[PDB]
Copies of this chain bind each other. A is one copy, B any other.
Amino acid sequence: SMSENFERKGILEKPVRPQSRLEFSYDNPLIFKNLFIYFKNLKSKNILVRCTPTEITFFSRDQSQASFVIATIDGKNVNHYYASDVFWLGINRELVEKMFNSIDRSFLKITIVHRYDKPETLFFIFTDFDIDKECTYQITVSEPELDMDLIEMEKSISEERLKNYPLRWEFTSKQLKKTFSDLSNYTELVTIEKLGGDTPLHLYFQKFNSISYHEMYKSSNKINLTSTIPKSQVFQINVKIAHIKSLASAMVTDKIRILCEENGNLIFQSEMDALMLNTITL
C-alpha cells in the first residue's frame, strides 16, 4: 500500500458481503488482546457475545462469581460496523486464548465476521500490511448460556445509578496496578475509608505485631476524587484484592474510574477509544 491509511466509517447501512450477519473492522486490535488477558486473569470459562445494529458487547463472570464484566465496543467509534439484528453467541475463552495473545504490533487491523451460511462459526482476521499477510481464524461458537442476571447487571451500570455512588476517583492503570500489587504482597483484603468533607482517601490494612500499611491520598483533586458522604460521616468498606489485581494487571486502558458504595460493591470504568469496559464486583 503506502509505505516508508484507514478511515473510520462507523455503522454501515449494509454489509459488503451479502451473507454477513455481522461485519466488524477496527484499527486497534490490541484492545482485544488486553480484553482477553483480563478474561484470562479472571479465569472466565465462557464469553457471552451480544451483537446489535449499534454495538457488540462481551459479557463474562469471574470463576469465583464475585465479578461481572461488561465490555462494549461502539459501532460508531469503529472503522467498519454492520449487524443485521440482535443475536447472541457463546465463545469458549480457552479456545481463543492464544489467538488473542498472538495479536502484536505487526497487525494493524482486526476483522470479525459472522455469516448466516456458517451459523456456528466466528471469523477473526488479522492483517499484516507490511507483507499483505492475512491471518484468518475460524472459531466454533455455541448458542450462548443465556444468563438471566445479565439484565440486572446492565441495569446496574446505568447513569441513573452510578451518580448515587458516594465515593469515586480515578487511577491510571499503572497506579491501580501499583496499589493492588503492593497490597497483594501482604493481604487479601483492604479497607477503604473516607471521612465526609475534604479529608484524604485512606487505604489500609492492619496486622498486629508484624506489619500495618496505610496508603493516603492527600490531594483529592489529583486523583479526581469526589465525595457525596455527609460531612463528618465515615465511609468504610472492605474489598478483595484478587479480582482488582486481575483488572489492573491486564492494563486494559489508561484511566480507570473507581466507584464505591457503602455495602462494599465496587464498579470499575475503564474507557479507551471504542471500548467501554465495566467491572461490577458484588
Chain A interfacial positions (CB closer than 8 Å to B): 95-96, 98-99, 101-102, 104, 106, 130-140, 174-175, 178, 181-182, 185-186, 209-219, 222-223
Contacts of A106 in B (CB 8 A): 174, 178
* A175: B residues at CB distance < 8 A: 131
A210–B133 touching, CB < 8 Å: no
Residues of B with C-beta under 8 A to A214:
135-136, 138
Q: 11 other contacts beyond A96-B211, A131-B217, A135-B213, with CB at 8 A cut-off?
A: A95-B210, A102-B178, A102-B185, A131-B223, A132-B219, A133-B216, A135-B215, A136-B216, A138-B212, A138-B214, A140-B209
The minimal Cβ–Cβ distance linking A174 to chain B, given in whole angstroms, is: 8
> Which of A132, A175, A210 has the largest number of chain B CB atoms within 10 A?
A132
By the criterion CB–CB under 8 Å, are B137 and A211 in contact? yes
Q: Which residues of B contact A99 (CB under 8 A)?
A: 185, 211
**Chain B residues whose C-beta falls within 8 Å of the C-beta of A136 in the assembled complex:** 213-216
Check A133/B215 contact, CB under 8 A, given A98-B185, A102-B185, A106-B178. Answer: yes
Contacts A/B (CB < 8 Å), 30 sampled: A95-B210, A96-B211, A98-B185, A98-B186, A99-B185, A101-B185, A102-B178, A102-B181, A102-B182, A104-B178, A106-B178, A131-B217, A131-B219, A131-B222, A131-B223, A132-B217, A132-B218, A133-B216, A135-B182, A135-B213, A136-B214, A136-B215, A136-B216, A137-B211, A137-B212, A138-B211, A138-B213, A139-B211, A140-B210, A140-B211
A229 to chain B, nearest CB (A): 20
Complex contacts, A139 vs chain B, CB 8 Å: 211
Copies in the complex: 3
Structural contact, A211 and B131, CB atoms closer than 8 A: no
Given A95-B210, A98-B185, A222–B132 Cβ distance below 8 Å?
yes
Cα distance, A211 to B222, chains bound together (Å):
47
Point out the residues of chain B lying under 8 angstroms from A95, CB to CB. Answer: 210-211
User: For the complex, what is the distance from the CA of A98 to the CA of B98, rounded to whole Å?
Assistant: 32
What's the nearest-Cβ distance from chain B to residue A181, in Å?
8
Complex CA gap A138/B175 in Å reads 22
A90 to B219, CA, bound (A): 35
Q: Which of A133, A135, A138, A217 has the most CB of B within 10 A?
A: A133
**Complex-state Cα separation, A98 to B175, whole angstroms:** 17
Q: A219: which B residues are within 8 A, CB to CB? A: 131-132
Known: A140-B210, A209-B140, A210-B140. A134 touches B215 (CB 8 A): yes
